[PDB]
Amino acid sequence: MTVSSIASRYGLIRRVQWKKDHAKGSLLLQLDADPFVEQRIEGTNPISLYWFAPVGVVSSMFMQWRGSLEYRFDIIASQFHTGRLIVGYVPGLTASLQLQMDYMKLKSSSYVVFDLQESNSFTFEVPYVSYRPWWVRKYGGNYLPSSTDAPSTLFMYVQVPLIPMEAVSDTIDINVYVRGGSSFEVCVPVQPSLGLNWNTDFILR
Amino acid sequence: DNPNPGPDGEGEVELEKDSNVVLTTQRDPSTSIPAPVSVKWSRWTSNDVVDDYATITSRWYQIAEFVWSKDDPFDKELARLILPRALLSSIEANSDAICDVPNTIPFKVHAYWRGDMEVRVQINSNKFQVGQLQATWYYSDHENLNISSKRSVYGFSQMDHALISASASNEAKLVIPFKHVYPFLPTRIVPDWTTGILDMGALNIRVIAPLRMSATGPTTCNVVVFIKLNNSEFTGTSSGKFYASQIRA
Amino acid sequence: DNPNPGPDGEGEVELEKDSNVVLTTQRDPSTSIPAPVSVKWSRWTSNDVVDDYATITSRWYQIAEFVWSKDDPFDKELARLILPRALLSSIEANSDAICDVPNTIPFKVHAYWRGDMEVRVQINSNKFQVGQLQATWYYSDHENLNISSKRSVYGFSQMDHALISASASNEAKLVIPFKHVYPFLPTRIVPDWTTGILDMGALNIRVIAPLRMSATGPTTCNVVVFIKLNNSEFTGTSSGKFYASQIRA
Amino acid sequence: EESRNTTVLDTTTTLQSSGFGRAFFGEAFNDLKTLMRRYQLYGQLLLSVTTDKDIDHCMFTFPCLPQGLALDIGSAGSPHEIFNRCRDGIIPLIASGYRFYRGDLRYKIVFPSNVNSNIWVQHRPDRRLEGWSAAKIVNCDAVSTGQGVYNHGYASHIQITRVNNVIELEVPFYNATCYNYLQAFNASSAASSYAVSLGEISVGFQATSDDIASIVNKPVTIYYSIGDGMQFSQWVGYQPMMILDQLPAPVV
């Protein structure tokens, strides 16, 4: 039972369709550089369930986190698909700076350009840039004046669009896996901001 | 003990030569150091390329000039500068952008900053003028609401400060290290930090002895403040379009 | 000789990690070096603070992307970039100032520059596409009036160049050292130098083999050009308001 | 240029140093941390129950900070006579002469006597402190958010009133900072609110609606020492003081 053994396990959090008609610089995903990355289930319950990475579940129990995250991008393509994309990383952005974003402002900050010819998988290790040694978690124990956004924001644009051959498909799935890297660590135990789905029943007062 | 003035004037110039900017003082500086020398902290919370630019950031640049007259009472503030904001606001008060001065071009492009400071407060007063000023540094002025009753020379004499006598026309050197709750100050709008951006506290120059003279003496004198950022470190390389102008005040 | 692909794809990624920017190549680069490695020349004509900023200037940044289609003839230029001007003009073509990119903020504040270059021209072409491009560097394009008859792949093959085949989808690395008549290029309007400011010559990408395919093949492909300034030195610290925008072209 | 001496005109002789009372009283009063580890009243309150409470509801809440709360003079009708007459204690008077702190605190909470019910105490280091207003002991009157409820993961302890009606606990330093502010806090940003107090202590009873009637208007007092490893790290001079025997007397 070890937090560095739980957070070192990849969990699938995202699938992204990358198509042929995606123009040069179209946004594929923007997300938050934190373990609290969500995948909502389209259920009919009045309260919605979410998929998390194991690093996010083990970080929900703790107040403060720090360290590098590792995003594994598995691009399901043949050896006849050719493309090129940036997995970039902008240090701290507010909510009003989540927009006004392209692939050109991304290249001012740290970024990695990946070519897709024969190797269809890579791993981007996320820097930890903050004014604070740790970082207070994203959600509170149903105390809404304790909400805090990410330290920083991850983007994934399309640097060179997809050129597929006429015998293969025109759409490509991209899986995004999250695990807390070799420098990831959490400290202070608090009430965890997540609950089980065993008894998914809430009572309004 | 044996004066012999010549065409030069029988003086001894002290020089501060810091990255192609040279400051000259006839007198001896009256130094005051509030806190000991800080450590670099790129180890604990940064993985980005962390680099100072000591050729352009450890230079001298004026941030305030003002006129101390004889029409000022006993306890009256002359200057109140929130120095990391006051550098950028002194540039923006000269009606241009921040990318036109080599001292502040990493502030346009980076996100966070930590470094020590060197402040020179130079008076140009006549030998026959009589008066005295404080040069008191206070860490994090805005985070104390009872500071409006604190701003007086009685309270600022209790913490360490630098005295400037108008008779000797001496000089106040202020070695200000980084001492803040968080180990970095953001240069722009950053998450859960919207106001008080890049504020570390107030250097406030007040009067102890008001400027006294004869009936026909020189009425005013001038005070100029220079700043230096020596032990800097810049992290979080970002776009310059995310940066916004400082609050005017 | 024994293929065994897995979920990764059986490849070998080559990495160019230069100051928090990482470029990945599946293929081997086809390099071409026009001149040997230059010397630093701050000794002979500068007394100002001379310092590169290798943390922010030796980064990669895109300067051109374009679409090579099958509707291009044999000898047809695709790109013609005056690279030191083309970096600033590629930033200004994205409708902002030059102080918003960390690569070019010393160009806003300094006067002269000398440094070597690294150019990566990356194509994204399908394996079934057939074609080939040149990556020819020419020193000081504008100082030769008969260059309009020179711009052809017959003449550019005689000097050294980098070949880009659309079938292998390979890559062109271009180590461009500083070779100019004067040992420094001014960044702005400087005395008796009003036009051709910061111009060292043209990287011009032309076609040898036009893009050929079947009747229903993928019609176009994309080409992206990245630049690096590694052995830089900036001298003549000046005001940023003296700087003016580049010629549009 | 503060502690300088141009010319010391000593007309005196050598005075015998007592070692800060160690010669006379067997103890040296030089280390001020020894003075600050003496307990001093953090506050007092009368318990008041407006709505019907569950077992999970917290009875009262207060932020835990070393420079002392907003000085509760009380109502104009019934003032708290300790904070009204002799305004403030030793520990915040020392802490006014500094800017930053780092370290733990020690809280000793004394409950009323005739109550028997089992008492829980949680420390939540999640609650940011929003302004010097509402930096005080807050009677929890309603439960909307997760504030009123006994939560799971926090550092908690349950005192048995049948054995002993006093709890003695140590609040640790859990902020992600170098220091915290040690003055009357003025909220500028949102991140500065995380760095005022150590955390937020909530005290609750497990009584039901029938046994809570004997708890109304009973006093609860809270005392605090300074702990150890507790360091003040920037000298700031003192604010304007007020003289206590110059205060008016309640004439008849």
Instruction: Indicate the DSSP class of residue C93.
Output: T
The span from the CA of A162 to the CA of A22, in Å, is 8
- A 1-40 residues with CB < 8 A to B: none
Decide if B100 and C108 are in contact by the 8 Å CB cutoff: yes
A15: helix, strand or coil: strand
> Which stretch of DSSP H or E encloses residue D23?
helix D22-25
Query: Of C106, C98, C54, C16, which is closest to residue C229 (Cα–Cα)?
Result: C54
Nearest CA in chain C to B102: C109
Decide if D128 and A146 are in contact by the 8 Å CB cutoff: yes
The span from the CA of D207 to the CA of D223, in Å, is 24
- Provide CB contacts within 8 A for B238, sequence distance 6+: A90, A91, A92, A108, A109, B109, B110, B111, B188
Q: Show which subunits contact A, needing at least 3 CB pairs below 8 angstroms.
A: B, C, D
Q: What are the boundaries of each domain within chain B?
A: 1-249
- Distance, C-alpha D169 to centroid of its chain: 13
- The two tokens of residue D130 are 């929003």
The span from the CA of B89 to the CA of C237, in Å, is 22
A72: helix, strand or coil: strand
Distance from CA of A147 to the nearest CA of B (A): 9
Query: Of B77, B81, B44, B50, which is closest to residue B64 (Cα–Cα)?
Result: B81
From chain B, the residues in CB contact with C108 under 8 A are: 99-100, 105
Q: Are strands B112-114 and B185-186 parallel, antiparallel or unpaired?
A: antiparallel
The span from the CA of C27 to the CA of C29, in Å, is 6
- Provide CB contacts within 8 A for D188, sequence distance 6+: B142, B143, B195, B196, B199
Backbone angles phi, psi at B45, to 5 degrees: -140, 25
Chains A and D touch (3+ CB pairs under 8 A): yes
- Provide CB contacts within 8 A for C189, sequence distance 6+: C197, C242, C244
- D 194-213 residues with CB < 8 A to B: 195
Query: Of A56, A87, A57, which is closest to residue A73 (Cα–Cα)?
Result: A87
From chain B, the residues in CB contact with D179 under 8 A are: 180-181
Decide if A82 and C126 are in contact by the 8 Å CB cutoff: yes
D224 touches chain B (CB under 8 A): no
Decide if A189 and D153 are in contact by the 8 Å CB cutoff: yes
From chain D, the residues in CB contact with B189 under 8 A are: none
> Which stretch of DSSP H or E encloses residue C83?
helix C83-92
Angle, alpha carbons B24-B29-B33 (nearest 5°): 125
> Which stretch of DSSP H or E encloses residue A147?
none
Q: Are D87 and D161 in contact (CB under 8 A)?
A: no
> What is the Cβ-side half-sphere exposure of residue D206, based on CA atoms within 13 angstroms?
11
C143: helix, strand or coil: helix
Distance from CA of D224 to the nearest CA of B (A): 23
Decide if D191 and A132 are in contact by the 8 Å CB cutoff: yes
D152: helix, strand or coil: coil
The span from the CA of A202 to the CA of B2, in Å, is 94
Q: Are D208 and D132 in contact (CB under 8 A)?
A: no
Amino acid at A32: D
Dihedral angle over CA of A44, A46, A51, A57, nearest 10: -160
Chain A residues at the D interface, defined by Cβ less than 8 Å, are 61, 63-64, 131-136, 140-146, 188-192
Mutation target for B interface from C17, C21, C237: give the one with most B CBs within 10 A: C237
C27 touches chain A (CB under 8 A): yes
Decide if D191 and B182 are in contact by the 8 Å CB cutoff: yes
- The two tokens of residue A153 are 């924001």
The span from the CA of B139 to the CA of C125, in Å, is 59
Angular region, B192: left φ>0, alpha ψ -120 to 50, beta rest: left
B99 touches chain C (CB under 8 A): yes
Beta bridge partners of A90: A153
CA dist B3 to B6, B11, B12, B169, Å?
Answer: 10, 10, 13, 20
Distance from CA of D210 to the nearest CA of B (A): 45
The span from the CA of D73 to the CA of D79, in Å, is 6
Nearest CA in chain A to D152: A191
Angular region, B93: left φ>0, alpha ψ -120 to 50, beta rest: alpha
From chain C, the residues in CB contact with A104 under 8 A are: 62, 94
- The two tokens of residue C20 are 């928090």
Among A111, A120, A161, beta carbon nearest to C9 = A120
Q: Are C152 and C226 in contact (CB under 8 A)?
A: no
Q: Are strands C221-229 and C117-124 parallel, antiparallel or unpaired?
A: antiparallel
Distance from CA of B40 to the nearest CA of D (A): 13
Distance from CA of A195 to the nearest CA of B (A): 26
Q: Are C125 and C69 in contact (CB under 8 A)?
A: no
Q: Are A84 and A113 in contact (CB under 8 A)?
A: yes
Among A134, A142, A188, beta carbon nearest to D145 = A142
What string of DSSP letters covers D79-102?
B-HHHHHS---HHHHHHTTBSEEE
D151 touches chain A (CB under 8 A): yes
A127 touches chain B (CB under 8 A): yes
D192: helix, strand or coil: helix
Nearest CA in chain D to B30: D1
Query: Of D188, D183, D87, D69, which is closest to residue D136 (Cα–Cα)?
Result: D69
Among C19, C53, C105, beta carbon nearest to B108 = C105
- Distance, C-alpha C143 to centroid of its chain: 19
Among A108, A109, A133, beta carbon nearest to B45 = A133
- The two tokens of residue A131 are 């004014």
From chain A, the residues in CB contact with B109 under 8 A are: 108
> What is the Cβ-side half-sphere exposure of residue B234, based on CA atoms within 13 angstroms?
25
Amino acid at B103: N
Query: Of D39, D38, D61, D37, which is closest to residue D166 (Cα–Cα)?
Result: D39
Among D125, D152, D194, beta carbon nearest to A188 = D125
The span from the CA of D103 to the CA of A7, in Å, is 30
Among C99, C102, C106, beta carbon nearest to B237 = C102
The span from the CA of C34 to the CA of C158, in Å, is 12
Instruction: Indicate the DSSP class of residue D121.
Output: E
Among B144, B162, B182, beta carbon nearest to D183 = B144
The span from the CA of A132 to the CA of C238, in Å, is 35
Distance from CA of A70 to the nearest CA of C (A): 15
> Which stretch of DSSP H or E encloses residue B87?
helix B83-92
- The two tokens of residue D196 are 């005022």
Cβ-based contacts under 8 A for chains A and D = 53
Distance from CA of B231 to the nearest CA of D (A): 19
Give me the sign of the Cα torsion angle A99, A100, A106, A109.
negative
- C 150-209 residues with CB < 8 A to B: none
From chain A, the residues in CB contact with B240 under 8 A are: 108
D214: helix, strand or coil: helix
CA dist C244 to A43, C111, C188, Å?
Answer: 58, 12, 7
Decide if B191 and A92 are in contact by the 8 Å CB cutoff: yes
From chain C, the residues in CB contact with A122 under 8 A are: 13, 24
Q: Are A82 and C126 in contact (CB under 8 A)?
A: yes
> Which stretch of DSSP H or E encloses residue A59?
helix A54-60
Decide if A142 and D124 are in contact by the 8 Å CB cutoff: no
Strands (E), B42-170: 61-68, 77-82, 112-114, 117-124, 130-139, 162-165
C219 touches chain A (CB under 8 A): no
B102 touches chain C (CB under 8 A): yes
From chain A, the residues in CB contact with D155 under 8 A are: 189
- B 101-160 residues with CB < 8 A to A: 109, 111-112
Burial of D173 (0-12, 13-18, 19+ CB in 10 A): middle
Query: Of B104, B90, B63, which is closest to residue B188 (Cα–Cα)?
Result: B104
A106: helix, strand or coil: helix
Q: Are A26 and A159 in contact (CB under 8 A)?
A: no
From chain C, the residues in CB contact with A68 under 8 A are: none
Q: Which residue reads 């810049």 in tokens?
A: B234
Nearest CA in chain B to D3: B160
Q: Are B172 and B164 in contact (CB under 8 A)?
A: yes
> Which stretch of DSSP H or E encloses residue B33?
none
> Which stretch of DSSP H or E encloses residue A121?
strand A121-126
Burial of D9 (0-12, 13-18, 19+ CB in 10 A): exposed
> Which stretch of DSSP H or E encloses residue B232?
none
C150-179: burial string, b at 16+ Cβ within 10 Å, e else = ebebeebeeeebbbbbbebbbbbbbbbbbe
The span from the CA of A199 to the CA of A196, in Å, is 7
